[PDB]
Design a protein around this ligand. Structure first.
Ligand code: ACV
Ligand code: FE
Length: 329
């Protein structure tokens, strides 16, 4: 069998308040989990995840093939050259099971200075017709801000955990310019499930998505109650239990770079499971020009032999690399 990964449940509610000592005790828990398997569940987070799941299901189960082409990213529809990140990511029956919808900062409007400058990684979201999907856009935009709020609180815990002031990361995570994204991923139940949509790991495990490190500062994930994730540890790949009441949190490779691998970006993969389920990540990305000077909390002077990297450079190249490694989603 496969061993269960150590993934503690951390009550993150003090990170929304002003009890500094209580916040330090949460930071310690974040530190411990980040130094161990690299994963934890954030609980007492204040977000209505049952309603998120319900609204997402209503969207996934009612969108039609016509609407998917009309919302498609450039990888599926050559007419949409501006849609690299935001839009619909189609399934390919018989070959690719997964499908999803990605959206960015709602403040990336046509008049936004980065949209006017045509800066890479910034795009204006595309949405289905309101009459076909009543309330969806409004729900989705509000969800972006609710999960942004949780992510800001989490970033205060990570900063304190690293011996910094609580705004160390959060000062670079702002509503007017964050490159953060929400992805509403549908993993379907299929009968027969196409073998071409099932990958096989070197250890024989059937997968839907191969091993990788995340392209993010941190990743804030809701998933249905169907076990699927595995994390590589010193004892090998271990199963991460599902918890559809909490948010699964881990660091991405920007955090590993900034901390000189004190907080590693854990390697993880997605097992193949023949079940209708949801995987709804929020990728906590900073602004395009955000630069955090690398440091090392294991070194007496805190210095590291790594060079500063702008978040926009990191992101554009990371997303392309992930597609080259693990395939177009
Ligand atoms: C592991 C889950 C987070 C999920 N995987 C994922 O979402 C995988 C690996 S973290 N992520 C990506 O492909 C990056 C999507 C980036 C997004 N188009 C954007 O422009 O910002 C899954 O369930 O497969
Ligand atoms: Fe990941």
């Amino acid at each position: 069998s496969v061993s269960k990964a150590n993934v503690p449940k951390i009550d993150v509610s003090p990170l929304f308040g002003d009890d500094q000592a209580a916040k330090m005790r949460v930071a310690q828990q974040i530190d411990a989990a980040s130094r161990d398997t690299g994963f934890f569940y954030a609980v007492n987070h204040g977000i209505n995840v049952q309603r998120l799941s319900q609204k997402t299901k209503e969207f996934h189960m009612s969108i039609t093939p016509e609407e998917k082409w009309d919302l498609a990213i450039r990888a599926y529809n050559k007419e949409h050259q501006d849609q690299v990140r935001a839009g619909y990511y189609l399934s390919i029956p018989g070959k690719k099971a997964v499908e999803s919808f990605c959206y960015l900062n709602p403040n990336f409007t046509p008049d936004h200075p980065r949209i006017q400058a045509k800066t890479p990684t910034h795009e204006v979201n595309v949405w289905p017709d309101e009459t076909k999907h009543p309330g969806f856009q409004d729900f989705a935009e509000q969800y972006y801000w609710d999960v942004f709020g949780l992510s800001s609180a989490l970033l205060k815990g990570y900063a304190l955990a690293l011996g910094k002031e609580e705004n160390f990361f959060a000062r670079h995570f702002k509503p007017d310019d964050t490159l953060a994204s929400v992805v509403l991923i549908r993993y379907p139940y299929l009968d027969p499930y196409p073998e071409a949509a099932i990958k096989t790991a070197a250890d024989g495990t059937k997968l839907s998505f191969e091993w990788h490190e995340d392209v993010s500062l941190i990743t804030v994930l809701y998933q249905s109650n169907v076990q699927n994730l595995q994390v590589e540890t010193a004892a090998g790949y271990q199963d991460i239990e599902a918890d559809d009441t909490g948010y699964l949190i881990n660091c991405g490779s920007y955090m590993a770079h900034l901390t000189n691998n004190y907080y590693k970006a854990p390697i993880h993969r997605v097992k193949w499971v023949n079940a209708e389920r949801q995987s709804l990540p929020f990728f906590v990305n900073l602004g395009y020009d955000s630069v955090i000077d690398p440091f090392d909390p294991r070194e007496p002077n805190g210095k590291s032999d790594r060079e500063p990297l702008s978040y926009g450079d990191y992101l554009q190249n990371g997303l392309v690399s992930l597609i080259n490694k693990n395939g177009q989603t």
